[PDB]
C-alpha cells in the first residue's frame, strides 16, 4: 500500500514530457509503466502483485520483431500517460485505468506484418477476422492474459464497470487500425468545426479516444530527431521483410516496403507526415489543446526529413 515506485531524477522529470524516450534498459520498462499507472490512476487502481504478473505475461507475449515489440508497447503507453496527465480533469476513473492497459496491450503477439500481408498470405487470422485482422487478435490476446489465474487486474470492479473498461480497451485497440483512422479524424474535424463535438456523447468520446490511440501509436514521429531517425530504421526493417514476403508470393510490394527502393524512403516519410501524422496531431491539438507539443515535435521532424532530401544530412 505504502510502496511507491520512484525513478532516478532525470527520468522523474523527463517522463512527464511528450518526447520522453524510455531508454535501452529493458528491465526498467515495467517499473516505468507502474510509475505511470500510480500517478495517472492512483496507487490503489491495481493490486501491485496482479499488475506485475500482468505486465510480465504481456511482455512475454510480445515477439522479438524490429519495431512492433515490447519497447513499442511501453513507448505508446508513455504517450497516453503524457496526454492523460496534461488533460487531468477530462477523463473518467475507468478511462484512465483502461487506456494505459489498452496501449501496453495494443500490439500483443504482433508478427511484424500488416493486415494486407495476412490477407494475401491467407493467414488463418484473416478467416477468423475479415477487417482489423491483427487488432482483433491483439484484443483477444489481452482477454486471454486477463483470464490467466492471478492476472485479473480489474477483479475489484463491479460486473458493469468490468464490461465498461473491457469495452474501452476493445474500441481503443481496434482504433489502432490506421485504415479506420482517416474517417475517424475526418468526422472529428467536421464535428469540431460545426461545433457539434460534445464530450458527454459516448459515441464522441469513443472517436476522441480513437484519435488519442492513433496519436500514441504514431508517437515515434514526435520524438527528438535522433530518436525518430533511429526508430525509422526499425520500422523500415519490418516493412522491407514484408516486401520480401510479398515478392515470395509473386506480388510486387508498394515501394515503401521494397528494399531495392531505399532511395525513395525520405520522400515516403514526407508523404506519411503530410497524409497521416500532421493531420492526426493537428485535429488532436484542436480537441485537446495541451497536446500541442506533439504537433510541434511532428512538424520539427517533417522539417528534418525535408533536410535529408535536400542533401543537408
Ligand atoms: C514512426 N513511423 C514512420 O516513420 N512511418 C512511416 C510509420 C508508419 C506507421 N504505420 C503504417 O505505415 C501502416 N501502413 C499504412 C501507411 C499508409 C496508409 C495506410 C492505410 C491503411 C493501413 C495502413 C497504412 S502500411 C505501410 O500499409 O503497413 C506507423 C508509424 C510510422
Ligand atoms: Mg498495431
Ligand atoms: Zn502499434
Q: Largest beta sheet, briefly? A: none
Topology as a string of helices (H) and strands (E): HHHHHHHHHHHHHH
Tell me, briefly, the overall form: globular
Counted up, domains total 1
CATH superfamily: 3'5'-cyclic nucleotide phosphodiesterase, catalytic domain
Give the helix level as a range of percent: 55-70%
Rg is 19 Å
Task: Classify the beta-strand content into a percent band.
Answer: under 5%
The third-level CATH topology is Catalytic domain of cyclic nucleotide phosphodiesterase 4b2b
Question: Structural class, from helix and strand content?
Answer: mainly alpha
* Amino- and carboxy-terminal Cα gap: 51 Å
The count of DSSP E runs of length 2 or more, i.e. the number of strands, is: 0
CATH class: Mainly Alpha
Ions, cofactors and other bound molecules: the ligand Cn1c(=O)n(C)c2cc(NC(=O)CN(c3cccc4ccccc34)S(C)(=O)=O)ccc21, magnesium ion, zinc ion
- What's the assembly state of these chains? monomer
Name of the CATH architecture: Orthogonal Bundle
Count of discrete alpha- or pi-helical segments spanning 4 or more residues: 14
Binding site for 3',5'-cyclic AMP: 68, 269
Subcellular location: Cytoplasm, Cytosol
Active site: 68 (proton donor)
GO molecular function, one term: 3',5'-cyclic-nucleotide phosphodiesterase activity
